[PDB]
Protein backbone atom coordinates (compact mmCIF):
# COMPACT_ATOMS: atom_id res chain seq x y z
CA UNK A 1 0.00 0.00 0.00
CA UNK A 2 2.88 2.42 0.65
CA UNK A 3 3.54 2.49 -3.11
CA UNK A 4 -0.08 2.87 -4.31
CA UNK A 5 0.15 4.62 -7.68
CA UNK A 6 -2.09 7.16 -9.37
CA UNK A 7 -3.92 6.21 -12.50
CA UNK A 8 -3.32 9.15 -14.83
CA UNK A 9 -6.72 9.75 -16.37
CA UNK A 10 -6.51 11.09 -19.92
CA UNK A 11 -9.06 13.75 -20.79
CA UNK A 12 -7.79 14.28 -24.29
CA UNK A 13 -7.20 17.75 -25.70
CA UNK A 14 -9.31 20.85 -25.21
CA UNK A 15 -12.11 21.36 -27.74
CA UNK A 16 -14.81 23.99 -28.02
CA UNK A 17 -17.14 21.17 -29.05
CA UNK A 18 -16.58 19.60 -25.63
CA UNK A 19 -17.22 22.89 -23.87
CA UNK A 20 -20.46 23.55 -25.79
CA UNK A 21 -22.04 20.07 -25.75
CA UNK A 22 -22.52 18.36 -22.39
CA UNK A 23 -20.68 15.09 -22.15
CA UNK A 24 -23.78 12.97 -21.52
CA UNK A 25 -25.40 14.32 -24.67
CA UNK A 26 -22.22 13.77 -26.71
CA UNK A 27 -22.00 10.16 -25.53
CA UNK A 28 -25.65 9.52 -26.37
CA UNK A 29 -25.14 10.78 -29.90
CA UNK A 30 -21.85 8.95 -30.37
CA UNK A 31 -23.34 5.64 -29.27
CA UNK A 32 -26.45 6.11 -31.39
CA UNK A 33 -24.70 7.21 -34.57
CA UNK A 34 -22.43 4.16 -34.29
CA UNK A 35 -25.55 1.95 -34.19
CA UNK A 36 -27.12 3.85 -37.09
CA UNK A 37 -23.93 3.63 -39.19
CA UNK A 38 -21.70 0.81 -37.94
CA UNK A 39 -19.34 1.26 -40.89
CA UNK A 40 -18.77 4.95 -40.22
CA UNK A 41 -17.16 6.85 -37.37
CA UNK A 42 -18.07 10.24 -35.88
CA UNK A 43 -15.25 12.76 -35.80
CA UNK A 44 -14.81 16.28 -34.43
CA UNK A 45 -12.24 18.49 -36.16
CA UNK A 46 -11.16 21.83 -34.70
CA UNK A 47 -8.33 24.28 -35.25
CA UNK A 48 -5.52 23.88 -32.72
CA UNK A 49 -4.44 26.70 -30.38
CA UNK A 50 -2.22 29.30 -32.04
CA UNK A 51 -2.69 27.84 -35.52
CA UNK A 52 -2.46 30.45 -38.29
CA UNK A 53 -4.64 28.84 -40.94
CA UNK A 54 -8.06 29.06 -42.52
CA UNK A 55 -11.19 28.33 -40.58
CA UNK A 56 -13.10 25.08 -40.92
CA UNK A 57 -16.83 25.73 -41.36
CA UNK A 58 -18.11 22.45 -39.94
CA UNK A 59 -16.65 20.53 -37.03
CA UNK A 60 -18.63 17.28 -37.20
CA UNK A 61 -17.83 14.57 -39.74
CA UNK A 62 -19.39 11.16 -40.23
CA UNK A 63 -16.61 9.25 -41.95
CA UNK A 64 -16.62 5.82 -43.62
CA UNK A 65 -14.36 3.66 -41.48
CA UNK A 66 -12.37 2.42 -44.47
CA UNK A 67 -11.30 5.92 -45.52
CA UNK A 68 -7.73 6.61 -44.57
CA UNK A 69 -6.38 9.46 -42.50
CA UNK A 70 -4.66 10.67 -45.65
CA UNK A 71 -7.94 10.82 -47.54
CA UNK A 72 -9.54 12.72 -44.68
CA UNK A 73 -6.54 15.05 -44.69
CA UNK A 74 -7.14 15.99 -48.31
CA UNK A 75 -10.85 16.39 -47.62
CA UNK A 76 -10.19 18.86 -44.82
CA UNK A 77 -7.55 20.69 -46.86
CA UNK A 78 -10.13 21.20 -49.59
CA UNK A 79 -12.79 22.43 -47.17
CA UNK A 80 -10.47 25.17 -45.88
CA UNK A 81 -9.29 25.97 -49.44
CA UNK A 82 -5.64 25.43 -48.61
CA UNK A 83 -3.06 25.86 -51.34
CA UNK A 84 -0.94 22.80 -52.06
CA UNK A 85 2.25 24.34 -50.66
CA UNK A 86 0.63 25.17 -47.31
CA UNK A 87 0.99 22.67 -44.49
CA UNK A 88 -1.74 21.02 -42.49
CA UNK A 89 -1.16 18.63 -39.59
CA UNK A 90 -3.65 16.58 -37.62
CA UNK A 91 -3.29 15.71 -33.95
CA UNK A 92 -5.08 13.08 -31.87
CA UNK A 93 -4.09 13.32 -28.21
CA UNK A 94 -1.16 15.57 -29.17
CA UNK A 95 0.20 12.99 -31.68
CA UNK A 96 0.21 13.17 -35.48
CA UNK A 97 -1.51 10.04 -36.85
CA UNK A 98 -0.03 8.15 -39.80
CA UNK A 99 -1.66 8.90 -43.13
CA UNK A 100 -1.92 5.24 -44.14
CA UNK A 101 -4.12 4.30 -41.16
CA UNK A 102 -7.86 4.01 -41.63
CA UNK A 103 -10.14 6.42 -39.83
CA UNK A 104 -11.79 3.32 -38.38
CA UNK A 105 -8.53 2.20 -36.81
CA UNK A 106 -7.78 5.67 -35.50
CA UNK A 107 -11.27 5.76 -34.02
CA UNK A 108 -10.99 2.28 -32.51
CA UNK A 109 -7.69 3.17 -30.85
CA UNK A 110 -8.43 6.72 -29.75
CA UNK A 111 -12.13 7.57 -29.55
CA UNK A 112 -13.06 9.33 -26.32
CA UNK A 113 -15.65 8.20 -23.80
CA UNK A 114 -18.37 9.99 -25.76
CA UNK A 115 -17.65 7.71 -28.75
CA UNK A 116 -16.27 10.56 -30.83
CA UNK A 117 -12.80 10.79 -32.33
CA UNK A 118 -11.23 14.22 -31.79
CA UNK A 119 -8.77 15.71 -34.29
CA UNK A 120 -7.09 19.10 -34.02
CA UNK A 121 -5.48 20.71 -37.06
CA UNK A 122 -2.69 23.24 -37.40
CA UNK A 123 -0.28 24.84 -39.79
CA UNK A 124 2.53 23.53 -37.55
CA UNK A 125 3.63 20.01 -36.70
CA UNK A 126 3.93 21.00 -33.02
CA UNK A 127 0.45 21.22 -31.50
CA UNK A 128 -0.15 24.69 -30.14
CA UNK A 129 2.80 26.34 -31.88
Numbering used by the authors: -11 to 117
Please give sentences taken from the publication describing this entry.
The ITC experiments demonstrated that the NSs4 bound with sub-micromolar affinity to all six of the human LC3-family proteins under the experimental conditions (20 mM Phosphate pH = 6.5 and 50 mM NaCl) with the exception of GABARAPL2 which bound with low micromolar affinity. However, crystals were obtained by fusing NSs4 to the N-terminus of either GABARAP or LC3A, a method commonly used to examine the structures of LIR motifs with LC3-family protein. In complex with NSs4, both LC3A and GABARAP adopt the canonical Atg8 fold, similar to what has been observed in previously reported structures of their free forms as well as in other structures of fusion proteins with LIR motifs. Likewise, NSs4 bound in a linear conformation to both LC3A and GABARARP in a similar manner to what has been observed for a typical LIR motif in complex with an LC3 protein. In both complexes, the predominant interactions at the binding interfaces involve the side chains of F261 and V264 of NSs4, which are the residues located in the first and fourth position of the core LIR motif. These residues insert into HP1 and HP2 on the surfaces of LC3A and GABARAP respectively, which is consistent with most other previously determined structures of LIR motifs in complex with LC3-family proteins.
LC3 proteins carry out their various functions during autophagy in part due to their ability to interact with other autophagy factors that contain LIR motifs.
